[PDB]
Design a protein around this ligand. Sequence first.
Ligand SMILES: *[C@@H]1O[C@H](CO)[C@@H](O[C@@H]2O[C@H](CO)[C@@H](O[C@H]3O[C@H](CO[C@H]4O[C@H](CO)[C@@H](O)[C@H](O)[C@@H]4O)[C@@H](O)[C@H](O[C@H]4O[C@H](CO)[C@@H](O)[C@H](O)[C@@H]4O[C@H]4O[C@H](CO)[C@@H](O)[C@H](O)[C@@H]4O)[C@@H]3O)[C@H](O)[C@H]2NC(C)=O)[C@H](O)[C@H]1NC(C)=O
Ligand SMILES: *[C@@H]1O[C@H](CO)[C@@H](O[C@@H]2O[C@H](CO)[C@@H](O[C@@H]3O[C@H](CO[C@H]4O[C@H](CO)[C@@H](O)[C@H](O)[C@@H]4O)[C@@H](O)[C@H](O[C@H]4O[C@H](CO)[C@@H](O)[C@H](O)[C@@H]4O)[C@@H]3O)[C@H](O)[C@H]2NC(C)=O)[C@H](O)[C@H]1NC(C)=O
Ligand SMILES: *[C@@H]1O[C@H](CO)[C@@H](O[C@@H]2O[C@H](CO)[C@@H](O[C@@H]3O[C@H](CO)[C@@H](O)[C@H](O[C@H]4O[C@H](CO)[C@@H](O)[C@H](O)[C@@H]4O)[C@@H]3O)[C@H](O)[C@H]2NC(C)=O)[C@H](O)[C@H]1NC(C)=O
Lengths: 55, 110, 212, 55
Amino acid sequence: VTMPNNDKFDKLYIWGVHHPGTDKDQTNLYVQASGRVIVSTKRSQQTVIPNIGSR
Amino acid sequence: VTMPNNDKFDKLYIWGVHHPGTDKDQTNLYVQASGRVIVSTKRSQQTVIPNIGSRPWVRGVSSIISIYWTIVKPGDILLINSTGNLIAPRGYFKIQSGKSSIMRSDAHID
Amino acid sequence: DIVMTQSPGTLSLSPGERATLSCRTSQGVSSSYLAWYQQKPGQAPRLLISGSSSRATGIPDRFSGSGSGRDFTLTISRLEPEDSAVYYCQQYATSPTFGQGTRVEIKRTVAAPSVFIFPPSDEQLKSGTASVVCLLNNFYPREAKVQWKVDNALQSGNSQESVTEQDSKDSTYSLSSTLTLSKADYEKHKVYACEVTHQGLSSPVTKSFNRG
Amino acid sequence: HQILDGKNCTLIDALLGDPHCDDFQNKEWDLFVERSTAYSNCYPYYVPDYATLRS
Ligand SMILES: *[C@@H]1O[C@H](CO)[C@@H](O[C@@H]2O[C@H](CO)[C@@H](O[C@H]3O[C@H](CO[C@H]4O[C@H](CO)[C@@H](O)[C@H](O)[C@@H]4O)[C@@H](O)[C@H](O[C@H]4O[C@H](CO)[C@@H](O)[C@H](O)[C@@H]4O[C@H]4O[C@H](CO)[C@@H](O)[C@H](O)[C@@H]4O)[C@@H]3O)[C@H](O)[C@H]2NC(C)=O)[C@H](O)[C@H]1NC(C)=O
Ligand SMILES: *[C@@H]1O[C@H](CO)[C@@H](O[C@@H]2O[C@H](CO)[C@@H](O[C@@H]3O[C@H](CO[C@H]4O[C@H](CO)[C@@H](O)[C@H](O)[C@@H]4O)[C@@H](O)[C@H](O[C@H]4O[C@H](CO)[C@@H](O)[C@H](O)[C@@H]4O)[C@@H]3O)[C@H](O)[C@H]2NC(C)=O)[C@H](O)[C@H]1NC(C)=O
Ligand SMILES: *[C@@H]1O[C@H](CO)[C@@H](O[C@@H]2O[C@H](CO)[C@@H](O[C@@H]3O[C@H](CO)[C@@H](O)[C@H](O[C@H]4O[C@H](CO)[C@@H](O)[C@H](O)[C@@H]4O)[C@@H]3O)[C@H](O)[C@H]2NC(C)=O)[C@H](O)[C@H]1NC(C)=O
């Protein structure tokens, strides 16, 4: 998904990544196994790998 | 494993993660293939993925250990989930702050 | 703070015509967070449109919503005399803000005022006040001139008035003019007249009463 | 100067949208005041670069 900034000001996007306690929790909420989150702009780059484990 | 801080002071846990030179080295020491180390508290979060590959030769070894530290507050709990490659802590350093420092010098102490 | 600017301020169209209303926003607003309202004089706002083009329950299909970013539109395909109201846009992407409003007038075949005049009651006169009333009834357009004459002498600075809003069924207006004199001043004179000038009048109309 | 009493919310809880901080949605301040009494009451989270974000 993209979200273009066509306003006269800077936008601040707050987001996150969920890390499950177990592997069962992973697949129940997100069928697919631990995968990646990539949030990119023309200045930045933010890759996050989810790490499953008991917290 | 957890280790709860029920003392009146902060605990300093020094630990690390071992990164093998080869994949054979990985499975010999830790059956399982490269997996994760997760060291968590109620304030912090520390995930480490082991990365296997040939390192600089140091005294017989072409591998390396990454060193990490954690502070556990009173009422907080050290919690370690590890699937392998963990260089575990044996306990904690009592950590404080004060008229204490460090200096680099070759001056003779007299 | 998202500012909503509506265009035009006032819109006047006859029945059967299409009305187009515009809304300009200070920030880009997602089209899924914008609404349109109708407010008929004295009523609460009626939700017409939500989600920019989604029609609310109980709204006629002649009401159409459009737009994106900062440019939004309300279209009324087939005007009725019932559509005489103020229209508002609202954004709800942040804490709700609304426009200044667009006043829509429905046009009507020029109608002359049915003119009436009323003297002060004896009951009122007993208080020391003598208010005199003139009614211009069911006319179009709203523009109308009312002149008060006391013994054929134009008064001024004593005559207050108000006008009802356009009727939602027959699109006409009505006007109440009140000449307020004192009892004592009322009793110095005997002829009281109300002169009305209007578009539906080929010449001015005068109503009056005598005494005293 | 316009004071905003953070009360039982931290600036980051107010940001993220912790349920007991709904009163802070879309608010402004010349000075935001954090109280020691403040707490969190939502999903467990970690803000790497917390201090930077708060600032
Ligand atoms: C990825 O890429 C790098 C670079 O190409 C490569 O790194 C190389 O790794 C190998 C093995 O891991 C290592 O091999 C020798 O390491 C010792 C150092 O050799 C150096 O010696 C000098 C320092 O003293 C130095 O100036 C030189 O320039 C030279 O580099 C060397 O002593 C070793 O030899 C002993 O060990 C082997 C077994 O491993 C025996 O077969 C030898 O006979 C010898 O053992 C003898 O001596 C010991 C005591 O020293 C004794 O206990 C024993 O019983 C016997 O008597 C190694 O031959 C290279 O040095 C290293 N190169 C660099 C530049 O770092 C990686 O291996 C690559 N990865 C893969 C998978 O290929
Ligand atoms: C910010 O956070 C603080 C701390 O969490 C809140 O302070 C507490 O708020 C709760 C909810 O309003 C209060 O609960 C009320 O407690 C009264 C006393 O009961 C206990 O109170 C304290 C706290 O548990 C104990 O230490 C004490 O020993 C008592 O056992 C009750 O009388 C209240 O009962 C009724 O209150 C109203 C009706 O009046 C309704 O909510 C209910 O009908 C309820 O039955 C209630 O249980 C609590 O007392 C507060 N703490 C203290 C120390 O007073 C703040 O409210 C919160 N928000 C701010 C500050 O804006
Ligand atoms: C974090 O800590 C928890 C503490 O319990 C730890 O949970 C353990 O996870 C392992 C890994 O999933 C569980 O072991 C599994 O149990 C059964 C039989 O042992 C099987 O489902 C698994 O075997 C797989 O192995 C095959 C070889 O590849 C696979 O191909 C196949 O899919 C099999 O399913 C596996 O052995 C273990 O049961 C739990 N422990 C408890 C008490 O439930 C968790 O692993 C830790 N996180 C880490 C290490 O990253």
